[PDB]
Ligand binder design. Structure first.
Ligand SMILES: Nc1ncnc2c1ncn2[C@@H]1O[C@H](COP(=O)(O)O)[C@@H](O)[C@H]1O
Ligand SMILES: Nc1ncnc2c1ncn2[C@@H]1O[C@H](COP(=O)(O)O)[C@@H](O)[C@H]1O
Ligand code: PRO
Ligand code: PRO
Ligand SMILES: [Mg+2]
Ligand SMILES: [Mg+2]
Lengths: 496, 497
């Protein structure tokens, strides 16, 4: 019917109601797996089409590798298998007959693809090799599952590239990272912070991991929104991906891998949804505009149909709801997230105008028919997009606090902020901060029931350090390493 | 690199060489699973884009349901689970720990989707409900795996529709079947025969199954190319998919399901490939035209202009100006990979203001005056290639369908590589009789035997269009025990994959 708990009253219950009552998602009888209904899958198809077109400009090609991976392949890279083992699902029988060797469901495809890379790459003329696939992924998550954010089966693209040099590899890492920033900001109207993961948080077998971090204002938590890894020669040495180089010597290839998943949808909903339900960014909205005739009515009906037809020919995803009272119809499409409603009533036609209502702010205003067109409606949709992004970015920036000392850090953390702290890289320092922040923290009942914690973890070391204050005289948060002077700022906070 | 085994010499070895040396597919260390390389996956993406656009016109919407299904759901429809049980893969462990509840990988999604259909459908106003998904599926095939044709993981679309009446459901079955025909003929240049499966061959839980049958001329085998099922109320009764109708009664929904897979690619290759390698139908060719300068400043600029004009016209074109490679080497390189049209730009031809074209399917070479060169005229050549590929295969298929009124005629036509039209009266026992008896009297190649195939004939389909078939008068049932069941249609029987 409608949403009966406010977003700030019970966040996880609000989330469940919004994603199901909007017809985005349904629950399923396999734990941690969910059903993507049409309006929801439309968002992921929209991301696919945009991202596919951008990586084609880079020479990346789509492929499909198998779902299954052998134990022998999985166990090839030391760091990788150790970091993924407990989350690997194993097929052990077919029908009633046991397999000779159990085989695993892919948690990620490095060990599935790279034996082929070693065969296909023989010369520098075979490089760069840049492949991508849109697939499903299985990770038997131990943490509490969260729709979209953390599902046991999820959908992604994973790109895997091999290069003759580190310089080419580095360039791709940040090129893809910019593309992930563009998916979030230009399609989903979600602002991001680009950064590098600390040593403790980076991908197993990577030399370094970059990330686009996102912020959930309601409970003050970050979400790792997508990652782009430089694997160096770590995987090519273990899988023997070698090539006859320019210096006539045999060299190991430099590799990257990068992935973006349906976690995007959860961030979009958690950022933009409100107490009336979904609020869809126009460029991924299954329906961008709904036209509602307010109901002698013959003329009004024909003008209503012409408005619909003009928008449809312009390529706007438009619906005509000529079914029920206006108020009931209004709630119907508001719950489902439609960005713009056009109301055509008799009083409006007398003044040669229509009434518009934008979902993100609820503002209502009139537009003269002389100003109505496919292009002017598109401009309204772009204005909504910009407002949604600008609002979220302003809130995010206000909720990032420079905390030079521990008391500032704990205060900002417990009031739902992310923190920029003086940082000197150390696994021991990161663990110290995680433990001490947890001990001095408090979180909502909803977060506690969701299996979340009040601990602060490292989110990223932001790429752009230019707006941050001076590090002079600042002390390490970890007293045992007081002599290791902070040499950058790191973003820490609570997370999913 | 080249194909060193001929298509007619050793079909399975030819097939392996063509799919790997063209960079379409690679083998993998899990039996029955294969790697789809870029040029190959491009064909399936091309099918996806065409088919998705067509079903959208019908109101079908894309979704995504989970990979996993519970034992409880799977066992809900009796016939369905009995027909798939031996092929279902089971997840039983995570990490080092046995799961308390094993879960299965989807062999097909009826039992995954229909509990939700029962929730989403409440009134006739909720109907029709038409959903589709592009997914991977797992069937732990007992038969020997065949790249594309029969893999243990394959990729498909599966559509699932529910209607208020049988009439609406029947109409959709044949609308989708026509779409499968169009995929094969208009994209893949493969001719099809539409028909209904016999009772013994139809989908488990279906009221009837329709099919597009295709023909592999080299070993005289049919391939079931895609299927469109009417499920009647069999699944809606078991999953309680009910609705309040207009007359205020409670009724079970009528349902269909229909699926087309990457088997399409295998049929495309087996039909069109030759002794030089892949032969790609132009509308799924990763590269439709390759432009090759014979090496010069003027010639280079004209070569680039040809490339630019074709690219602006939306043709998928490549310029092969690689330096340390001979022209003949370049020719073989792209012929092996299946490019349908090659343009050679040499100094002698440009002096006469013309270019040399070579079409992959027949190998014919001919010149085109630059005054006639354009995006449209090159597209016309590509469409001519497409029609030729389709017409050649259809002519070959039709010549290999023989009307066999008696058992001796049937065996003779079967052993000389034909499909056979036989007098037919539906009966599971008659079909089993024909299969067993033909197996005893048939012989197949070593290549087919090694591929896990059989020389036995099975029912392929009862063709929908019987209008060209001769009279059944005086013909006897092929099954002597059922002589009292008089033939009342013609059925297509033959060897198959
Ligand atoms: N359980 C999950 N559900 C959804 N997306 C996930 C999950 N785990 C990781 N991801 C996404 O997968 C990609 C790689 O994550 P990671 O290997 O943790 O860097 C990123 O785009 C993540 O957002
Ligand atoms: N093992 C397989 N590999 C590839 N395609 C298959 C396989 N089994 C069935 N198909 C395809 O899946 C769809 C359904 O097949 P069936 O359930 O036999 O009607 C059809 O389009 C078949 O061609
Ligand atoms: O799982 C990951 O994080 C990396 C990036 C995509 C493929 N593997
Ligand atoms: O497996 C089959 O044959 C049917 C058609 C697609 C969905 N299930
Ligand atoms: Mg993880
Ligand atoms: Mg089968």
């Amino acid at each position: 019917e409608g949403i009966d708990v406010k977003k700030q009253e019970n966040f996880s219950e609000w989330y469940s109601q919004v994603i199901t009552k909007s017809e985005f998602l349904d629950y399923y009888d396999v734990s941690g797996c969910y059903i993507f209904r049409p309006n929801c899958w439309f968002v992921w198809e929209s991301v696919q089409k945009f991202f596919d077109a951008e990586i084609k400009k880079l020479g990346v090609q789509n492929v499909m590798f198998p779902l299954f991976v052998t134990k022998r392949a999985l166990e090839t890279e030391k760091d990788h298998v150790e970091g993924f083992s407990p989350e690997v699902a194993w097929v052990t029988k077919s029908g009633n007959s046991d397999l000779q060797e159990p085989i695993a469901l892919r948690p990620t495809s490095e060990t599935i693809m790279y034996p082929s890379y070693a065969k296909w790459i023989q010369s520098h003329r075979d490089l760069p090799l840049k492949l991508n696939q849109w697939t499903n992924v299985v990770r038997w998550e131990f943490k509490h599952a969260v729709p979209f954010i953390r599902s046991r089966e999820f959908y992604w693209q994973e790109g895997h590239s091999a290069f003759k040099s580190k310089e080419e590899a580095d360039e791709e890492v940040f090129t893809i990272l910019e593309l992930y920033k563009r998916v979030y900001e230009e399609l989903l109207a979600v602002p991001v912070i680009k950064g590098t993961k600390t040593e403790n948080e980076k991908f197993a077998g990577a030399d370094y991991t970059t990330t686009v971090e996102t912020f959930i204002a309601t409970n003050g938590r970050a979400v790792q929104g997508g990652t782009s890894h430089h694997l160096g020669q770590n995987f090519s040495k273990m899988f023997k991906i070698q090539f006859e180089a320019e210096n006539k010597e045999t060299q190991f290839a430099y590799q990257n891998s990068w992935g973006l998943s349906t976690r995007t949808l959860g961030v979009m909903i958690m950022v933009h949804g409100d107490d009336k339900g979904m609020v869809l960014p126009p460029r991924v909205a299954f329906c961008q505009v709904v036209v509602i005739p307010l109901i002698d009515n013959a003329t009004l009906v024909e003008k209503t149909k012409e408005i619909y037809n003009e928008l449809e020919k312009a390529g706007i995803r438009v619906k005509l709801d000529d079914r029920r009272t206006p108020g009931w119809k209004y709630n119907y499409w508001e719950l489902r997230g439609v960005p713009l409603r056009i109301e055509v009533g008799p009083k409006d036609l007398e003044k040669q105008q229509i009434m518009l209502c934008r979902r993100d702010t609820g503002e209502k205003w009139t537009m003269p028919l002389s100003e109505f067109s496919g292009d002017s409606i598109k401009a309204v949709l772009d204005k909504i997009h910009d407002s949604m992004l600008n609002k979220a970015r302003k809130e995010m920036n206000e909720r990032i606090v420079v905390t030079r000392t521990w008391p500032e850090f704990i205060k900002a953390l417990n009031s739902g902020n992310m923190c920029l702290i003086p940082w000197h890289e150390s696994k021991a320092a990161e663990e110290y901060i995680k433990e001490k922040s947890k001990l001095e923290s408090v979180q909502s009942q909803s977060d506690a029931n969701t299996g979340l914690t009040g601990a602060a973890k490292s989110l990223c070391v932001p790429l752009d350090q230019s707006s941050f204050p001076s590090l002079e005289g600042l002390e390490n948060f970890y007293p045992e390493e007081a002599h290791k002077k902070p040499n950058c700022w790191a973003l820490f906070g609570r997370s999913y």
